C-alpha cells in the first residue's frame, strides 16, 4: 500500500521508490543520491521536525553502501507521530551522498560516523573527518570485507 508521504510526493511529482514497511509499519522510501539534497528540504517542509537517527549499513560485501535516515515530527497535540525511514544507496567504488546537515543539524556528528565506519563521503558537510577512529587511520572498519592489519597491541596478550 502507498504510504502517506509517498502519496504526497507523487501528488507533488517527486521521484522516489517505496521499499515497503518495517515490523512497525513505518514507510521505507528510496531516494536517488542526486535528488536527495532537494528532497530533504521538501521532507522538512512536509513537517519532519526531528531527525531521529542517521545510520549507514552494508547491503552486501562488495556491493552497495546504504545510508539510512529516520524522521519524525515533534509537535504539540499530536497523538501518534508520523515516522519515515529513507535509504540512499551509493556505489562502493566512490560513494557520494549529499549531506542533510544544512536541513537537520543532528546529522552533524552522525554523518561523520557514517564516513568513519563505512567511508560514505558527504559533500556539503563542512567538517567531514573521522570522529570515532583515530584521525590518521586508513580504512573503514565497519565494512563487511574489512581486515584489521595485524597491530601488535590488538594481538593476544601472550
Amino acid at each position: 500500500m502507498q504510504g502517506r508521504l509517498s502519496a504526497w510526493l507523487v501528488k507533488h511529482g517527486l521521484v522516489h521508490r517505496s521499499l515497503g514497511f518495517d515490523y512497525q509499519g513505518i514507510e521505507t522510501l528510496q531516494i536517488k543520491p542526486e535528488d536527495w539534497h532537494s528532497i530533504a528540504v521538501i521532507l522538512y517542509v512536509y513537517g519532519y521536525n526531528y531527525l531521529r537517527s542517521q545510520c549507514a549499513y552494508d547491503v552486501a560485501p562488495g556491493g552497495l553502501l546504504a545510508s539510512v535516515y529516520h524522521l519524525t515530527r515533534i509537535e504539540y497535540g499530536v497523538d501518534q507521530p508520523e515516522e519515515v525511514c529513507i535509504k540512499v544507496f551509493a556505489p562502493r567504488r566512490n560513494p557520494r551522498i549529499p549531506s542533510v546537515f544544512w536541513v537537520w543539524k543532528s546529522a552533524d556528528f552522525q554523518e561523520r560516523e557514517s564516513y568513519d565506519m563505512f567511508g560514505i563521503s558527504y559533500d556539503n558537510h563542512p567538517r567531514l573527518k573521522r570522529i570515532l577512529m583515530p584521525e590518521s587511520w586508513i580504512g573503514w572498519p565497519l565494512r563487511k570485507d574489512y581486515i584489521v592489519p595485524n597491530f601488535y597491541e590488538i594481538q593476544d596478550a601472550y
Binding site: 509517498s6 510526493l9 507523487v10 501528488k11 507533488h12 511529482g13 517527486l14 521521484v15 522516489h16 521508490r17 517505496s18 536517488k32
Partner: peptide, 19 residues
C-alpha cells in the same frame, strides 16, 4: 529492479493553483 516511482506522475498538478 522495478522502476523509480512518481516520475512526475503525468498529471501532478492537474488544474487549480499549482503547488
Amino acid at each position: 529492479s522495478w522502476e523509480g516511482e512518481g516520475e512526475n506522475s503525468p498529471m501532478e498538478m492537474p488544474k487549480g493553483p499549482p503547488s
